[PDB]
């Protein structure tokens, strides 16, 4: 019986060595979750940045980022959202040009549905410490719709009527109206984000576009900021 025990111990040692070798790789790799409204052009971001699940691995600055995206689970209830607890960040994709597109029908707005989804993600008992990277696609489409008449933000969003452009705003090298609309949408997302939790996790709103291809650098910088803030708060400096 001693020979069997010795062989089993040798097998255990081999499995433990393999487990350590895999642990090095697992700790090296950072995981991201891609969650979007569905019609917000998440695929266009995937093409530029890079079964129900779709996993792509992109590395930048010798850092391995592994992105997970799920589209098969279209149910409103999200019981798989609780598994992405160790992910570095949740990439949120929202089409800011979908305010006018009302909805199946009877939905208030696609942007309103995205706001509700973002609120549900933020106010989750499990994703309390998971930060969200927010991408607003179709900035060109939003500009085309806003500059064109007969489609006003205030018609669908009454809060836009009593709104002014932020003083501490950085316009791109834009019209006043499109800038006001973009910053109103960003402020809506930020007011949804900041109120629930403080310090545990932050929202990073980026005004990306289909033509833009620097989203990988933005995601890298956002992940670096997220880990720095996590480490700073763990040591009680931030």
């Amino acid at each position: 019986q001693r020979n069997e025990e010795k062989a089993q111990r040798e097998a255990n040692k081999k499995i433990e060595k393999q487990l350590q070798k895999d642990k090095q790789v697992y700790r090296a790799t950072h995981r991201l979750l891609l969650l979007g409204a569905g019609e917000s052009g998440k695929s266009t971001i995937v093409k530029q940045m890079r079964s129900g699940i779709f996993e792509t691995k992109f590395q930048v600055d010798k850092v391995n980022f592994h992105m997970f995206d799920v589209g098969g689970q279209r149910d409103e209830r999200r019981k798989w959202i609780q598994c992405f607890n160790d992910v570095t960040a949740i990439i949120f994709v929202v089409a800011s040009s979908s305010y006018n597109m009302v909805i199946e029908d009877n939905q208030t707005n696609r942007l309103q549905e995205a706001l509700n989804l973002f609120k549900s993600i933020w106010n989750n008992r499990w994703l309390r410490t998971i930060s969200v990277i927010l991408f607003l696609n179709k900035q060109d489409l939003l500009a085309e719709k806003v500059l064109a008449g007969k489609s006003k933000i205030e018609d669908y969003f009454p809060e836009f009527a009593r709104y002014t452009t932020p003083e501490d705003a950085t316009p791109e090298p834009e019209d006043p109206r499109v800038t006001r609309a973009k910053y109103f949408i960003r402020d809506e997302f930020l007011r949804i984000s900041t109120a629930s939790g403080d310090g545990r996790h932050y929202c990073y709103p980026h005004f990306t576009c289909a033509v833009d291809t620097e989203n990988i650098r933005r995601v890298f910088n956002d992940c670096r900021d997220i880990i720095q803030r996590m480490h700073l708060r763990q040591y009680e400096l931030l």
Binding site: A11, E16, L19, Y26, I53, G72, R77, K79, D86
Partner: protein, 331 residues
């Protein structure tokens, strides 16, 4: 339209169930002596999982168990000697369940990939990749070495044949996505609990849900037959565990404590059926006295939330695997 007829049938069912009820289980089991306090200490702690653990399954011999984690390693343990017999890399990192075949030759696991993977231990390599579920599958169990039942997020349970790789039959008509599943000791029947707070009983051969139990208020995360096979206990996010009886067609007792409000993740029964062990979200799995619904003991070894809780077939030990990647053997 037909909704009025459905409501009338539901009212008739409720009236029949109320008329069948004469006395509660408490009124009968209050006379018998209580179980008393029970203290359980972690005999062995199993170490080596990189990430959080979702599901485990004790072997038939009670010597071995298989554990699933998000790092992709499907580790098979020797619970007596605390040794890793095998470690199986997985195609998808995200896994929600695992199973151990009664013969011990096969091990099945699945996750968010919507695919049930079956691995042959003695030949490790993937024997068959089962596809046909549109939603994520949450639990897998083995009837025999050839038939496997998977519970998916498609709100439909399916029975597969490993040799042909196609579903022999499917179980439909259940509103929410199912997360828990338990087979009968005779393997003729099984149950599933979904997010619609209703746990249904199916017949594997017939393929129809004979009875439906809707006592819970929130999504059902756990389910498990009584060892007799005539009863089963369900755990939900409503912080309540309820014991349902098939012949009585309703719940007998509810296991709730006012101090704790965290939901139940996994439940299991002792060999005699007297003790109902239910994990909780508060990092503590509790031990209930099934007959009197009085909590006997609490296990506090784990740090993170428990996700799986099983009892050996011989009844010697209870294994709980939590999100801190540590699986503890209790006795």
């Amino acid at each position: 339209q037909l909704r009025q007829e459905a409501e009338q049938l539901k009212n008739q069912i409720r009236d029949a169930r109320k008329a069948c009820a004469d006395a509660t289980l408490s009124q009968i089991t209050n006379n018998i002596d209580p179980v008393g306090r029970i203290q359980m200490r972690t005999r062995r702690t199993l170490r080596g999982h990189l990430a959080k653990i979702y599901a485990m399954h004790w072997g038939t011999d009670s010597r071995l168990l298989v554990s699933a984690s998000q790092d992709g390693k499907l580790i098979i343990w020797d619970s007596y000697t605390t040794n890793k017999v095998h470690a199986i890399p997985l195609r998808s990192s995200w896994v929600m369940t695992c199973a151990y075949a009664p013969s011990g030759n096969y091990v099945a696991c699945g996750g968010l990939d919507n695919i049930c993977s079956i691995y042959n231990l003695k030949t490790v390599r993937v024997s068959r990749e089962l596809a046909g579920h549109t939603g994520y599958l949450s639990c897998c169990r083995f009837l025999d070495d050839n038939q496997i039942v998977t519970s998916s997020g498609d709100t439909t349970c399916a029975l597969w044949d490993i040799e042909t790789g196609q579903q022999t039959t499917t179980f439909t008509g259940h509103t929410g996505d199912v997360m828990s599943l338990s087979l009968a000791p005779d393997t003729r029947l099984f149950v599933s609990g979904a997010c619609d707070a209703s746990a249904k009983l199916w017949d594997v051969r017939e393929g129809m849900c004979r009875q439906t139990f809707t006592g819970h208020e929130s999504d059902i995360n756990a389910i498990c037959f009584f060892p007799n096979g005539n009863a089963f206990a369900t755990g939900s996010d409503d912080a309540t565990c309820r014991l349902f009886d098939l012949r009585a067609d309703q719940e007998l007792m509810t296991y709730s404590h006012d101090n704790i409000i965290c939901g139940i993740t996994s439940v299991s029964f002792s060999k005699s059926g007297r003790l109902l062990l239910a994990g909780y979200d508060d990092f503590n799995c509790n031990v209930w006295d099934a007959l009197k619904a009085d909590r006997a003991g609490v296990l506090a070894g784990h740090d993170n939330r428990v996700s799986c809780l099983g009892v050996t077939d011989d009844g010697m030990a209870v294994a709980t695997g939590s999100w801190d990647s540590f699986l503890k053997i209790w006795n």
